[PDB]
Design a protein around this ligand. Sequence first.
Ligand SMILES: NC(=O)c1ccc[n+]([C@@H]2O[C@H](COP(=O)([O-])OP(=O)(O)OC[C@H]3O[C@@H](n4cnc5c(N)ncnc54)[C@H](O)[C@@H]3O)[C@@H](O)[C@H]2O)c1
Ligand SMILES: NC(=O)c1ccc[n+]([C@@H]2O[C@H](COP(=O)([O-])OP(=O)(O)OC[C@H]3O[C@@H](n4cnc5c(N)ncnc54)[C@H](O)[C@@H]3O)[C@@H](O)[C@H]2O)c1
Lengths: 291, 291
Amino acid sequence: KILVKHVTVIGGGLMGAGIAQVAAATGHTVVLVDQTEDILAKSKKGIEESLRKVAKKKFAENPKAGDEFVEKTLSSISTSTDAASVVHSTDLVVEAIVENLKVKSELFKRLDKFAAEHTIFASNTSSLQITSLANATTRQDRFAGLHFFNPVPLMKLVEVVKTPMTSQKTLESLVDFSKTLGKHPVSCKDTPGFIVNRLLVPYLIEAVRLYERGDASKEDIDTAMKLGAGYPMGPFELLDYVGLDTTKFIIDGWHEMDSQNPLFQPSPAMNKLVAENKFGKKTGEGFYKYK
Amino acid sequence: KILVKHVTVIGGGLMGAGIAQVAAATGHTVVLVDQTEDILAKSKKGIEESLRKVAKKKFAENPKAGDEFVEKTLSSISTSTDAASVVHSTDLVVEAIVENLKVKSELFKRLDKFAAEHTIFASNTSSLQITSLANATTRQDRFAGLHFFNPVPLMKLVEVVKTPMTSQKTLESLVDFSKTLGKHPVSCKDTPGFIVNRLLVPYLIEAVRLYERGDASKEDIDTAMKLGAGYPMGPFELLDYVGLDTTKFIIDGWHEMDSQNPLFQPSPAMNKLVAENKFGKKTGEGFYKYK
Ligand SMILES: NC(=O)c1ccc[n+]([C@@H]2O[C@H](COP(=O)([O-])OP(=O)(O)OC[C@H]3O[C@@H](n4cnc5c(N)ncnc54)[C@H](O)[C@@H]3O)[C@@H](O)[C@H]2O)c1
Ligand SMILES: NC(=O)c1ccc[n+]([C@@H]2O[C@H](COP(=O)([O-])OP(=O)(O)OC[C@H]3O[C@@H](n4cnc5c(N)ncnc54)[C@H](O)[C@@H]3O)[C@@H](O)[C@H]2O)c1
C-alpha cells in the first residue's frame, strides 16, 4: 500500500476547508486549491478562526500551547490557484468542489494527466456516482469516494465509497489515512446515498409527508422523535440544519434515477420553502424561523 | 373535564408495571390487574426494586426518605384478578395486555358495562386500530390511545392517539394526566404507527434491505448511523433489542392494511430469522449473537 503524507485538497469551502484543517492538525502536508487567490485568502482565514475555537477547548488549561497549535498547524497548509502544478508530488487528491458532474469530470480528467502514478483520487460527492468520475480517468483502480460529514472537524464518520474498479491497495491506504485523521471509516458500495444519507433522507421526507397529511404537527413530530427515539434533533430541525435546498437537490436527483418510487416523490410543502428562499438556518428560515 | 385521580392498569407486564409504577409514584392511586396471583405478585415485587433504583442511587441529598417513599408509593397500588370488580370506581382504565385484537377487544366490551360513566378508556396498543377497539364499546367519545415507551419510568414521551370519535373533554383529560406523570404528550390521529414507530420502523427495515441488497455490512450500517446520524443504537442493534417478532408483527399488520406501499413490504431476511426463533436479545440471537 501507500502512506498518505502529502494531501491536495481542491475546493476550499465548507467541506474542503474542513478536510484541510483536519488533515493538517494530524500532521499532513496540505495544499489547498481553489479558484481565486482571494477565495483562498478567506478560506484560510476561516480555517484559522475554526482552529482557534478548537484550541480554546483542547488547550483550555494553557493558551500558549493553544496558540502554538494554531500556528504550527496552519503553517502546514499552503495554497494554489492551479492544482495542475502541485499534484505531480501529492499522495492524495481530495476533491470537494461544486456538486456538478460536468465540472468534476473535467477536473479529474485533467488532473489524471499530471498527478503521479501512485496518487489516489477521491471525491467527496454526496450525490454523484463515484463510478462516473472514476471513468473520467484511466486511474480507476486508484479512485474512490471519501465522503465526509459536516462539520468535518466534529464528525468522526467517513464513508469510503468503492467502485467495482477500486483496488484493495487503494482502500487500505484510504482507511489508514482516515484513521490518522482521527475518523472512523465504514466500507460502502457506489450506490445512491451510500449508507447514511440513503437511510437518513428518505426518513426526513416521510416526516414531512406525515406532516402534510395533517396526522400530526411539526413541533410534536420533533419532540416525538427526540424523546421517544432518542434522536439528537427532530426531523424538522434537522432539515433546517442541513438545509432544505441541499436536501431537496439530493432527493430530486434520486427521484429521477427512479421516478416510480414512492420514497422519492417531491414533498410539495418542501418545494414551498425552497422556491421562497427559506432554505433553513443558512437563511434564517425553513420549517422554522431562526433569529 | 375529569382530573384523573384513580387509575386502573390492566396488565402487569413490561409496560403495565411501568405505568402502574410511574402513576402511583405521581400521587395517583393505582390498581394492578392480571390473570394469575403468581403474576400480580412478581409485577409488584419488580416494581419495588425499580422504585429503589430510583431511590437507593436516586434522591442524592437525603437517602433516608427512600424505604419510606418506596413504601408510600408501593403502598398505594392495590391488586385484583378481576377488573370487573374494580372499574366500578376508577376514572381511567389503561390497558396493556397481550397484543391481540380479539382478546383486547372482548375485555373492553365487558368492562364497558361494569365501568363508571366519567371513566376513560385508553389502550397502549402499538399495532391495532384504536377505532376498532373503541367500537367494542359504546363509550367511543371516552376511548383513546395512550402510548408509552419502554421503560415507562424513564422514557418521557407518550403519544395521545385520538379517534375521530374521541372527545375534546377526553383528550385534555389525558393530556393533563400525562403531564402530571412528568411525561410529555404529543397528539396524533389513529393512523398506523402513530408518530414514532411510523417514522422509526420503516427505516429499520430499509436498513435491513440495504444489507440484503449486499451494499454494506450490518456492522458498518450500525457504526454509520451511530456516528453519522447520532443515533444511540445502530438499526440492527436496536432491532435485536426490540425483538424481530415484535417488529415483524407490526410490519405485516400495517402491510395488510396497505399492501401496495413498499415501505411495509416485509424483509425476507427478517422472516428467515424469526422463522427459526432468532428474535434478538430475548433469545440471545437476532442479527447478532449474545453469549
Ligand atoms: N456541505 C455538505 O452538506 C456536504 C457534505 C458532504 C459532501 N458534500 C460534497 O462536497 C462538495 C462541495 O460541497 P461544499 O459544501 O464544500 O461546497 P461549497 O459550495 O461550500 O464550496 C465549493 C468550493 O469549490 C470551489 N470550486 C468550484 N468549482 C471549482 C473548480 N472547477 N476548481 C476548483 N475549485 C472549484 C469554489 O470556489 C468553492 O470555494 C460537493 O461535491 C458535495 O456533494 C457536501
Ligand atoms: N413492550 C413494548 O415495547 C411496548 C411499547 C408500547 C406499547 N406496547 C403494547 O403493550 C401491550 C403489552 O405489551 P407488554 O410488552 O407490556 O407485554 P407483557 O406480556 O409484558 O404484559 C402484558 C401483561 O398482560 C397480561 N395478560 C394477558 N392476557 C390478559 C387478559 N386476558 N387479562 C388480563 N391480563 C392479561 C399478562 O399476563 C402480562 O403480564 C401490547 O398491546 C403492546 O402492543 C408494548
